[PDB]
Amino acid sequence: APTMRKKFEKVLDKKAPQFLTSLLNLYNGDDYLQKTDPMTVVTSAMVAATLDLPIDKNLGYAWIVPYKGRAQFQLGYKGYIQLALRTGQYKSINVIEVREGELLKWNRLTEEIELDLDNNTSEKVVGYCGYFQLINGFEKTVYWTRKEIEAHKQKFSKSDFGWKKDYDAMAKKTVLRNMLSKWGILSIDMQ
Amino acid sequence: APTMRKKFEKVLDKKAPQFLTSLLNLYNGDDYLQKTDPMTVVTSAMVAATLDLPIDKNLGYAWIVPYKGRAQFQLGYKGYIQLALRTGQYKSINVIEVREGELLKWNRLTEEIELDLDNNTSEKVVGYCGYFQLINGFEKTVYWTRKEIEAHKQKFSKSDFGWKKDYDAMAKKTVLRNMLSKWGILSIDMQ
Amino acid sequence: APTMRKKFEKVLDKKAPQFLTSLLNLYNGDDYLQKTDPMTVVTSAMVAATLDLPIDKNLGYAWIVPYKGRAQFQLGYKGYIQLALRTGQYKSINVIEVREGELLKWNRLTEEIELDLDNNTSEKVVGYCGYFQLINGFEKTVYWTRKEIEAHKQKFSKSDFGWKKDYDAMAKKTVLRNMLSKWGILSIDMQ
Amino acid sequence: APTMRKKFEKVLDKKAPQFLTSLLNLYNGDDYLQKTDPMTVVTSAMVAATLDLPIDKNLGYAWIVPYKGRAQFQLGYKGYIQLALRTGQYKSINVIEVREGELLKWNRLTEEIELDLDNNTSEKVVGYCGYFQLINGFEKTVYWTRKEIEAHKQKFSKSDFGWKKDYDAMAKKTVLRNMLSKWGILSIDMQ
Amino acid sequence: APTMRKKFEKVLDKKAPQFLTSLLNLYNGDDYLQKTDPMTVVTSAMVAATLDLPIDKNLGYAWIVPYKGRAQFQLGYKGYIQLALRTGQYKSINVIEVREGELLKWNRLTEEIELDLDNNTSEKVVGYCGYFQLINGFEKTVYWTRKEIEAHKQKFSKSDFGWKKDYDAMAKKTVLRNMLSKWGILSIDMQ
Amino acid sequence: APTMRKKFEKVLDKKAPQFLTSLLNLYNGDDYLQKTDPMTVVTSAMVAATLDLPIDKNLGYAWIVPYKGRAQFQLGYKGYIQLALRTGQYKSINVIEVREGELLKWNRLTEEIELDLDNNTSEKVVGYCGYFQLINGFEKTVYWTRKEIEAHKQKFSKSDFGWKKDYDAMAKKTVLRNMLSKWGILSIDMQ
Amino acid sequence: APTMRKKFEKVLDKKAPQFLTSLLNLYNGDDYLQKTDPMTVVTSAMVAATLDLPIDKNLGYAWIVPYKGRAQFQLGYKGYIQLALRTGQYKSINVIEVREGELLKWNRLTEEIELDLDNNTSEKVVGYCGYFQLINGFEKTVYWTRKEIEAHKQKFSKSDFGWKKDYDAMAKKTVLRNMLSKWGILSIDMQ
Amino acid sequence: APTMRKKFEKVLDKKAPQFLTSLLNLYNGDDYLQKTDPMTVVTSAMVAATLDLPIDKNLGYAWIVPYKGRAQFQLGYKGYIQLALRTGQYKSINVIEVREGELLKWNRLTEEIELDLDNNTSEKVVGYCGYFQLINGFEKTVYWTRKEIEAHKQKFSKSDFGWKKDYDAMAKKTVLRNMLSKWGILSIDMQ
Amino acid sequence: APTMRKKFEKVLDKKAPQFLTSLLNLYNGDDYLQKTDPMTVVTSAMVAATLDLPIDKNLGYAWIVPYKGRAQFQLGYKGYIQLALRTGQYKSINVIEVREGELLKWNRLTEEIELDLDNNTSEKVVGYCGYFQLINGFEKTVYWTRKEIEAHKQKFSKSDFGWKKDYDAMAKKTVLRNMLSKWGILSIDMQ
Amino acid sequence: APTMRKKFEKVLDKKAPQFLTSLLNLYNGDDYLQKTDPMTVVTSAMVAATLDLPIDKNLGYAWIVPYKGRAQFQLGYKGYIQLALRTGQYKSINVIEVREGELLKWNRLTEEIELDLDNNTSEKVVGYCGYFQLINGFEKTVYWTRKEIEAHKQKFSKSDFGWKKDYDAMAKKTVLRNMLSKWGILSIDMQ
DNA sequence: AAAAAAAAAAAAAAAAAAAAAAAAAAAAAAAAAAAAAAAAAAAAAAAAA
DNA sequence: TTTTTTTTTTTTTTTTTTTTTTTTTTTTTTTTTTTTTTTTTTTTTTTTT
């Protein structure tokens, strides 16, 4: 038992600046966590700083969100990218927007898609595509339409300010985060 | 005997942050493990952290479930994906939903299935299909119907909250986890 | 002599986490190995961890069973699958259940079997079939009836709890393990 | 001379785990090799591990048998199957039991045999048949009677425990091993 | 000159395990080669391992026999079978024993022989027959009597232990090896 | 010019083991080639290995004989058999000994010979006969007497050790080799 | 034009070993081609190897003879036999020597000759006869005397070493080659 | 149109070696075709190789002769013999020389000629005779005198070197070729 | 309808080389068919090659002559001979020239002609005679004079180059072709 | 019924080239059959080719003439000659022209006619005579005058181009065809 | 009854460099093998420009 | 620029046996180089029961 306590104390002392920065950023921010127990907020900042993911706004790697008076540590859509890059096994990641009259055919069985880029008749988007390929040959491609993204936003999202000014960025972020979370390979320790 | 103790101590010291993160996440969670022996919970967290599978909720790789006052470490449906990707011998993994009037014929002997996608008469699903192919030519395909999935859920599952709002996700997860567990090739050490 | 000792020590040090995981899982389990010599259990865990086959329950690759106060390391019905996949020469493996009024004829000399699937008059099973085919053209097919499986279970099996709730799974597992052990090609090192 | 020593050392270092597993299995077994020179046992384990044929009991590929105080490495009836499959030129191998009133005629010159299967008057066996066919058209068929098998067992076998409980398995194993050893084509390196 | 040296070195390095196995088997055997030059034994093992014919006792493909203080590599009666099967042009090979009152007539010009099998008056053998047929229509048949085999054994063989317990096996082996050596078609590289 | 050099180099690299085996067998043999230029011996071994005819003693397909200080590659009496079998157009080849009081008449114009076999008055040979028949109907028969064979041996052969112990084998070999060389159809590439 | 070049290159690559063997045999031979252009020798070896007729001495199918400083490819008296056998339409070919007091009468119009064989008064030859018969009924017979053969040898032959030791063989070869060249039917591709 | 092109291409590819041999023989020959268009020479070699009649000098079946700067393919006096033998309907062909005081009478109406052979008074020739007989009873006989042959040679032949050394061979060749061309039955495809 | 198309296609494919040879000979010839439709020329070559009558100049069996811009296939005076010989019912065919003072009398009713050959007073020809006799006894004889032949040549022939140098050959050819065409029996398929 | 269909199909397949030649000749000809049903033309060509009588113009054995929009197969004046010769019972056939002052008397009862040939006073024809005699003694003679032939031509013939340039040939053809058709003996199968 | 007829003459061919051998043969009979511990679940998501 | 949810297991233990035998032989080549020549000629008519 004392050995685990000493190891935990050493780990805690090794990562003081991240904890200090997270606490200072939380203090300097707005006042929306005043209805929750401070112990939960401290624990959330602790676990966030343990994973080398500060809570500073300029990076957007993690957040603290209160649920029923309890603070929860949450991962952003760039934390998955950070973990995937820390894994060190990826080769390519990309996500683009398919406009009107670009794709030719697409079947979900063989995951084969063909497009005719730089040949458009209008200036409105029709769908979005994402694709990531590893080093050992594994590849994955997904394609979403506007209706599915709208349904997902209506079902899950509970805000409308961000989705109004820039519709494309939120859709791209959702596609990227879903593709990376569901099928990606993640790791914690950098190699 | 002392050599094995030194090796075990070195292995323990090498993976402290995962153990710390798992313990902190368990502490910050709800109070449902208070009726079990803490030693079993500590051992379960230990073995979970040994396999590079943290117990944090944002990843969903493993769980701790108490059975008859004894805590047990359990693998999720993404842990199999993680192990398969760590193996480094796969080429493709996929699972889709076959809607009404899509498939033509299917026999379980030769595992040959043909479908006519993008040609539907209704908007209700009829079945689910899964398919994974390796690099050395080995392929595997499975097909489930709604009745079999309903029977499996009635026989094994003991909850109904998740199965109500989104029926398709649970069926896809069950098909994927069964196909990967029964016939897949798994490994622990990354290559 | 010293060179072999150094090589053995290096091999031992290379595979510490598997040994640690196996020992922890054995400790966390029930108390049924207390009537045997601990040295035999340690040796069995050692050889099990040497072959990249952990003893964790969630995988079911190997077991430790005591016989006359001596612990023995045993291979499950998925260890054969793992070794066959590690070989890298297979093309297809399958096992199905032949119901009432499905097969037409079957002779054990030429190993030729014909069936009329999706055309049944009842809902009771009559037999089981297994078939595996390699890449270089070698194929093997076996067919068992209910009477033979019942006789085998009565002769060899010494438990009845598992065979009661689900009769089909045990029969399929027995057919698969027998077909893979008697006629399959196995290997230890992954290619 | 130094070049051959370096090559031998490299070959030895390449196959350490098989040697370790064989030695551990020999140690964990019963005490029947204590009347022989340990150097011979070490050499036998060495040559057994050189051919990718471990000595573990669960596989039954090879054995170590002491003769006049000297240990000898011996091939089982599955080692021939393993070598034949490693050759990669086979198409079919089979062995069955001919019961009472099944075969019609059989001549040893043209190796032509005809049978009327699934038409029996009793439940006692009369003989055994074996047949293996290659890819380039070469085929071989053998047929043994009960008297010849009994004479062979009396002449060569020196134990009776195995032959009592299950008479058919030993006869089938003898037919298979004799047919594969005398007329089969074997190889060491996998292709 | 350097190119041939590099090619020879590559060929030597490609076939190390066979050489190692042959040397280990020679070392583990009895002490009868101590009166000969070790260089000749090494060269004989080298050429034996070059032709993919190990010197292990369990296979019986080749031997090393000392003549006037010089070791010589020799082919067994199964090496001819191995080479003939490696050729890939054969269709059938067989050898049987003709008992008393079985054959009717036999002339050595047209090589036509007729027999009445399964009709015997005694239980003593009278002669032996061998027959091999290729794919392109070429066939060859030979027939030996007891007197000729006895004369050959007296003239050439210099041992009597093997010929005493089992007279038929040695005669069959001699007929097979003579028929395959004198008239058969052999090859070294497998096709 | 470079293309022919590349083709020759590829052909040389394709047939290394035969060259290595021939050189090793020549080295392990007696010392009778020490009075000749090594370049001629190397060239002779090269051409011998090019035709898939190794120089090993156990086969007796080809020899190296020095003439006036120059080594020459020579074909044995089995090389003709090998080439004829490689041709793939033959149907039957045979050679027998005609004893006293067996043949009735023989004329060299129509090549018609009749004999009364199995009816002899003495045990001394009188002549030898050879006969080979193709598939397209072409047949050839030759008959030699003792006087002609003795004259040929006196005129051409320059040794007497072999001809003393076994007179019949040398006569049969001479008849076979002459009949196959003068009138047979030969080919190099196997079909 | 490129198509014919590709076809010629493929034909050249298909027959490399014959060209290599011919070149090696020419190199290993005596030095009598040093006064001619090497290009002509290379072309002659090329055309000789194109017709599946190697230039090796042990076969005697073709030769290279220099005329006025130009090498020429020439057919031997066995090349005609090889081509005739490749045709596949022959039934019988023969040539014999008619001794003193054997023939009775012979007219060149109807090509009818009668002889009384095995009835001689001396041991000196008087003439030679040749006869070949096809399958469709066509037959041809020729008869030469000693004077005509002597005149032909004096007129055409320019050497005397071969004609001295063995007079009969050269006469038989001349009769055979003339009869086969003037009236025979030849072909290049084997059927 | 494409079908005929494919058939022509297949026919061309089937007969490459004859074309290659003809071209190589033409290249290796003297320089007398340098004043003609190469396309005509290529076409002539093509048609010559199409009819299974190579242009090699050792056979003398066909020639290429330039006329007014245009190369022409020409048939020799042995090509007619080859075609007649390919027909498969002939029974006998012959041509002889009638010397002084041999024939008795000859009339051109009934084609009846009688001679008294082996009864001569001088050693000078007087005429030539040719005779060919089919299988169905058709026969043809021709007889030429010296004056007619001399007139034909003066009228048609434009060279004198060949006609000087050997007068009889040219006359026999002319008689044979005229008799076979004017009245013979020819065919292209062998039967 | 499809059956006749398949049969026609098979017949076309069976006779490709004749068509190819005819087309190549037509191409290599002079330019006199450039004023006609190529389809007619192709059809004429097709029908000419269908009847096993190539259009090569060295044989002179058939020709292509343009009439009013339309190519026509025409039979020569040797095609009738070829067809008559293919019939297989003829016994004798002949045509001679009757000189001055040879014939005695000739009447056209009974077709009886008598001549006194080898008794001439001048060296000028007076007429021509032709005679052909079958096997079943049918005979036919015709006799032409110089005036009738001159009248026929003036009426029908439209060229004078051939008729100038050799007057007898054209007259003999006309007599032969007229006698064979008007009264002969012809057939297409060889028997 | 199926047997007759198979026999008809075999007969059709046996005579393809004649049908092909007839169709090609009809196609290459002029356009005068375009007003008739193609089925009738095909049937007429079929029956014409069935009787071994091609429709090619160079032979003139048969024709196709349209009558009231229906094509009809017609026999020429040489088809009767062909059938009569196929019968094999004839001995002589002839037809001549009787000029002015040649015949003496002629009565139609006894069919006796006498003429004084080679004794004429003018150069104009007066009549025509025809005569054919069999082997068994049967003879037939007919005699026509100019008036009867003119009346027949006026009554039956409907063209005048042919009858103008050559009056004698048409009269001879009419006499021959009438005499052969009315009184001759005809057959279809050759004997 | 639809039948009259022709485009045909000819050559470039003689011949040889083949006789032959170094092969007789053996070290091989066979065994240690029968099979079991297996069924399954905890999962749906979002905070971003 | 905005804050959730859900549930807890089960079974069972082994046996069998050990070897043998024996070693070689044979020897050596030959011979010789070529030739000859180059074309021609000409194109449609007719009908229907």
Residue numbers in the entry:
A (entry chain N), B (entry chain M), C (entry chain L), D (entry chain K), E (entry chain J), F (entry chain I), ...: 34 to 224
Passage from the reporting paper:
Some bacteriophage encode a recombinase that catalyzes single-stranded DNA annealing (SSA). Redβ belongs to a large group of proteins annotated as the RecT family based on the protein from the rac prophage of E. coli. Here, we have used single-particle cryo-EM to determine a 3.4 Å structure of a homolog of λ-Redβ from the A118 prophage of Listeria innocua that we will refer to as LiRecT. The structure confirms that the RecT/Redβ family of annealing proteins share a common core fold with RAD52.
Standard single-particle analysis without helical symmetry averaging in cryoSPARC yielded a 3.4 Å reconstruction with fully interpretable density for the LiRecT subunits and the bound DNA at the central portion of the filament. The filament has an open corkscrew-like shape with an inner diameter of 20 Å, an outer diameter of 100 Å, and a pitch of 105 Å with approximately 10 subunits per turn. The two complementary 83-mer strands are bound as a highly extended and un-wound duplex to a deep, narrow, positively-charged groove that runs along the outer surface of the filament. One strand, which we call “inner” and color in yellow is bound to the deepest part of the groove with its nucleotide bases facing outwards. The other strand, which we call “outer” (orange) is bound to the outer portion of the groove with its bases facing inward to form normal Watson-Crick base pairs with the inner strand. Each monomer of LiRecT binds to 5 bp of DNA. Consequently, we chose to refine a model that consists of just the 10 subunits of protein and 48 bp of DNA at the central portion of the filament, for which the density is strongest. Although most of the contacts involve the sugar-phosphate backbone of each strand, the side chains of V98, Y100, and Q107 from the β1–β2 hairpin wedge into the base pairs at every 5th bp step to separate them. Overall, the duplex is about 1.5 times as extended as B-form DNA and is completely unwound.
